[PDB]
């Protein structure tokens, strides 16, 4: 079906505004922004919005690819036979959000409007973001938003309801997209007991322990937010096993998701032991690394064997591939495999850099540049997971 | 014939970039600009370009209106029936030129790179324009550029070639774009005579009495450079009379297009004889105004009774209109008539301010603000002229 001209025109308008806003933001950051001011909280807060916009772009690309490849994903998702959206709609929504995000970030730099406190722009931006979804009227996509709002209630409960493909899909893309949940806790502490709400200063050029009591671990306010998506997936898998009475896949998924529990708890334990300087800090570390390997060396084997269904024993013309592939060029498959292999090991370089010269506040600069790569890895994974599921559904 | 989605996307992208560039340019103009230099040369140089983009956008709106209203203009413009330029292409070209214009203006305002001091930017901009216009490569609407160049060559050498619709159409269009020629001549004079090229920027007030060599009428090139389009149209209609052998629509048209000769002659004479003392200048001024009265009144009786065929004795139900019309709303026609009268007599306010005020640099700024109004008058006039031409062609 042809798309309306107004839709493409809006997409182009929003895209152009986004590019020019990004360029002027970069120029303002390099030139006007002063060095002595701490800029950690700004990125620490806007990272969630940036990741959400990136994910919406990548979802638009994914659905474009699915429609062109011929995969009948509307039946897989059990959507209404309207497809509920074109890719232009995803692009337009994401461009709207990106324009709002850029405007708010520019306001947080230039401080345009007189004496308005600066600790309100991210609050207003996230308020608009949440209000765009929970809008009780019937405008601005009054169908897909309702579908997503009920699907986000089916997922976020877990054991009570049954299992659907949409639930599994959305719960998987909370594992990769965990930074959005991660910095909400930071925002909550920073606004509640770390800012100067009575005064007007959102930059705070000094440092302390209570000033930063939420970028560390300390209590469970950090690890539980880390493990919530893993908990949801674990419960969903266990419920599926209980309903279907199938041992192998669910009983291996249980461990495949509990290894994340073990890795997170051991890493947090090392952090809490080093918070004082205990001797066993040099012991528990020796576990973390290996308990990380058993993590990666699990999921990687799960990625190639069952997720994408590659390395098939009943192979064909293609080395280490399956007999039936829909995508045209095999270089896409090989590049995806190699980049998944590199990206799943995005912790080795982190350890390598966190073993050397002690640049002041060098901690989060590594994470800020590595967080966006997980979304790209998920974007790559989506194509092959959906195509394998389509092939399996068509086969039987 | 629906257009491809990529053209619409490009139109939207260019529109958004142009909008944001205009906003940031206005912000820089109000805030960044430091005033010790007369910025008027910049306005006098960039006014021609700005009017060019404005005219292109208005022409795009015009062709969209003709296509939607049902006025078959491709047949009467002797264009190829199976190959036309839709309004989207004109919008895209206008957006591209506006983006280049805004980039040049911003670079001139900020002076980012301190090697090419300031003067390279306008020369590069107009060089890009001319290189685009006469590019011999078979790209970027290679048919449209070649057709435009051929017809421009045909128009500029009028007394020899035969006369078609498009030739006198472009002659009429150029009759309302003498400001472009005046700006080009002023740029040439500025670069050749008074500019001290061996400098940087030129941050020296032009308040010194030695300026004005390229501002006045003096030797008498401004008058002819303004009056060329009148000469071309006069010779074209004379040749048309010679070919047609009769006088009813031809000799009166020649007189109408010749009145402006005496107009500009007396207008220039007043200015050049002001500095001599010459206690007879007002006498000339008298006649100047007097002559204006016929010219401003000669076109109006032509613009309504003959150009559009209005005020017909056989009107019928539609008073003060023609017998048959295509545009549905009569309010459009009435508003067009009133606006035509106002915009043709708009010279009265300009002369009143320039003769009753004591503010330096007044007449030129009033000319600047009234400049993007004659092109609007031409844009609206084209609708009814083309409709009347279509009805006349249908009649015979």
């Amino acid at each position: 079906q042809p798309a309306p001209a107004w839709t493409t025109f809006r997409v182009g308008l929003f895209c152009g505004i986004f590019i020019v806003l990004n360029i002027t933001l970069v120029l303002a950051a390099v030139f006007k922004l002063e060095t002595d001011r701490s800029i950690w909280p700004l990125i620490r807060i806007y990272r969630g919005g940036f990741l959400l916009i990136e994910f919406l772009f990548l979802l638009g690309i994914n659905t474009y690819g699915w429609r062109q490849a011929g995969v009948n994903h509307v039946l897989i998702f059990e959507l209404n036979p309207r497809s509920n959206l074109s890719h232009q709609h995803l692009f337009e929504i994401a461009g709207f959000l990106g324009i709002l995000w850029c405007l708010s970030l520019l306001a947080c730099f230039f401080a345009p409007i007189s004496v308005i406190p600066t600790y309100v722009y991210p609050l207003a931006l996230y308020g608009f973001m949440v209000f765009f979804l929970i809008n009780p009227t019937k405008t601005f996509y009054y169908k897909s938003r309702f579908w997503l709002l009920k699907l986000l209630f089916r997922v976020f409960t877990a054991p009570f309801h049954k299992v659907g493909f949409a639930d599994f899909w959305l719960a998987d893309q909370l594992n990769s997209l965990s930074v959005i949940l991660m910095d909400l806790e930071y925002m909550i502490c920073f606004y509640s007991l770390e800012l100067k709400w009575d005064e007007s200063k959102g930059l705070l050029p000094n440092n302390s322990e209570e000033s930063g009591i939420c970028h560390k671990y300390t209590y469970g306010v950090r690890a539980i937010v880390q493990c919530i998506p893993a908990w949801l997936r674990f419960i969903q898998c266990l419920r599926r096993y209980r309903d279907t009475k199938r041992a192998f896949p669910h009983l291996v998924n249980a461990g495949k998701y509990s290894t994340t529990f073990f890795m997170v708890t051991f890493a947090a334990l090392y952090s809490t032991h080093k918070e004082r300087g205990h001797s066993d800090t040099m012991v528990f570390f020796y576990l973390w690394i290996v308990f990380y390997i058993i993590s990666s060396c699990y999921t990687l084997i799960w990625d190639l064997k069952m997720d994408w269904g590659l390395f098939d024993k009943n192979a064909g013309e293609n080395t280490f591939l399956r007999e039936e592939i829909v995508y045209p060029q095999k270089a896409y498959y090989y590049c995806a495999i190699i980049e998944d292999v590199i990206l799943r090991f995005a912790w080795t370089i982190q350890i390598s850099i966190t073993s050397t010269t002690l640049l002041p506040h060098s901690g989060d600069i590594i994470a800020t540049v590595f967080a966006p790569l997980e979304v790209f890895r998920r974007f790559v994974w989506n194509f092959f997971r959906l195509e394998n599921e389509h092939l399996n559904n068509c086969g039987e």
Side-chain angles (χ1 to χ4, degrees), chain A:
Chain A
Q1 269 198 355
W6 290 109
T7 315
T8 319
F9 168 71
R10 288 201 289 287
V11 160
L13 190 138
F14 295 143
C15 174
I17 302 182
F18 195 43
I19 321 308
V20 63
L21 262 291
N22 259 267
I23 274 283
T24 187
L25 167 64
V26 170
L27 263 289
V30 54
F31 266 107
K32 174 182 221 153
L33 167 62
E34 81 103 4
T35 288
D36 194 54
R37 180 199 182 188
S38 70
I39 49 196
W40 292 135
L42 273 85
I43 40 152
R44 215 85 69 74
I45 291 177
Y46 286 115
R47 197 160 57 204
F50 177 47
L51 289 156
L52 188 45
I53 296 154
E54 166 183 7
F55 175 69
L56 267 305
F57 283 170
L58 294 166
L59 250 185
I61 301 184
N62 281 126
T63 178
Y64 177 177
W66 286 321
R67 314 201 181 141
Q68 282 322 328
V71 162
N72 171 342
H73 92 284
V74 86
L75 181 153
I76 295 174
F77 269 48
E78 261 295 0
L79 271 179
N80 173 253
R82 201 246 295 168
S83 44
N84 234 301
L85 261 77
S86 58
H87 39 281
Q88 296 120 344
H89 296 100
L90 286 156
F91 283 137
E92 163 194 338
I93 301 158
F96 208 150
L97 296 181
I99 285 177
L100 268 150
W101 175 71
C102 274
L103 261 56
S104 195
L105 212 181
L106 257 68
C108 261
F109 262 116
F110 285 126
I113 292 301
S114 300
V115 302
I116 291 196
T118 186
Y119 42 81
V120 317
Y121 299 106
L123 257 171
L125 169 68
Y126 281 86
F128 216 134
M129 257 172 167
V130 59
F131 284 175
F132 177 82
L133 192 33
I134 64 181
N135 171 41
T137 73
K138 302 153 191 303
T139 52
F140 287 171
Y141 311 107
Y142 82 115
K143 249 171 201 282
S144 271
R145 298 173 312 141
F146 287 175
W147 183 79
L148 165 72
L149 259 177
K150 84 161 79 72
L151 201 73
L152 190 133
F153 195 52
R154 306 214 100 254
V155 171
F156 251 73
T157 51
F160 299 143
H161 326 314
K162 213 179 306 291
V163 54
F165 190 89
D167 279 83
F168 157 85
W169 186 92
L170 209 159
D172 258 307
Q173 320 174 29
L174 309 152
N175 271 4
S176 302
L177 263 154
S178 92
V179 191
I180 39 184
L181 289 132
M182 271 261 266
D183 314 49
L184 261 53
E185 189 258 328
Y186 189 75
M187 185 179 211
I188 263 60
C189 328
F190 173 46
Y191 269 141
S192 66
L193 66 173
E194 287 183 7
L195 212 32
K196 311 321 153 286
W197 272 58
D198 317 309
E199 320 165 49
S200 181
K201 285 185 80 32
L203 71 173
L204 202 61
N206 65 270
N207 275 65
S208 96
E209 165 271 306
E210 283 128 349
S211 293
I213 192 165
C214 285
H215 63 236
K216 319 257 175 191
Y217 276 96
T218 80
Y219 328 120
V221 304
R222 204 51 160 131
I224 302 188
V225 188
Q226 193 74 10
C227 215
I228 270 176
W231 188 234
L232 297 176
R233 266 301 280 151
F234 182 30
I235 306 169
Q236 258 188 76
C237 155
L238 253 174
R239 171 69 199 279
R240 208 200 201 134
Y241 158 66
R242 187 188 306 159
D243 292 358
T244 320
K245 196 154 311 173
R246 283 278 254 142
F248 170 78
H250 318 119
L251 270 295
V252 302
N253 283 29
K256 193 263 191 153
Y257 287 109
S258 81
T259 173
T260 284
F261 287 65
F262 266 122
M263 181 285 258
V264 165
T265 185
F266 270 121
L269 202 72
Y270 163 100
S271 284
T272 60
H273 271 238
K274 204 190 129 180
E275 98 176 41
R276 164 280 291 281
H278 186 36
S279 52
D280 315 330
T281 282
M282 333 169 276
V283 157
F284 274 140
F285 186 79
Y286 263 32
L287 296 139
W288 178 23
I289 274 297
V290 53
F291 249 100
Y292 221 124
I293 279 281
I294 307 183
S295 189
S296 299
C297 284
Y298 209 145
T299 175
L300 205 33
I301 315 294
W302 195 250
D303 279 20
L304 280 311
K305 270 311 196 223
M306 321 275 308
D307 263 337
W308 310 348
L310 290 159
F311 290 177
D312 179 352
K313 293 78 159 183
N314 251 330
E317 327 300 315
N318 314 67
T319 297
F320 277 154
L321 249 55
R322 53 179 147 279
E323 62 95 8
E324 171 46 278
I325 56 199
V326 56
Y327 293 118
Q329 196 154 327
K330 285 63 191 153
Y332 300 127
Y333 290 82
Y334 293 111
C335 288
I337 288 158
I338 208 59
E339 303 214 9
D340 186 316
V341 153
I342 319 149
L343 283 161
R344 194 67 94 159
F345 283 82
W347 52 295
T348 41
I349 301 161
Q350 147 173 23
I351 304 149
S352 299
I353 190 192
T354 42
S355 284
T356 38
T357 168
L358 294 93
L359 173 96
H361 254 278
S362 38
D364 271 346
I365 183 174
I366 318 145
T368 319
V369 82
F370 275 136
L373 293 163
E374 271 295 10
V375 186
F376 183 81
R377 174 191 80 81
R378 188 53 64 176
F379 154 66
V380 152
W381 172 90
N382 278 123
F383 278 121
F384 302 97
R385 174 71 220 219
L386 256 289
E387 83 99 5
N388 177 33
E389 258 310 309
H390 169 232
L391 259 80
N392 163 55
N393 255 321
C394 284
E396 63 249 41

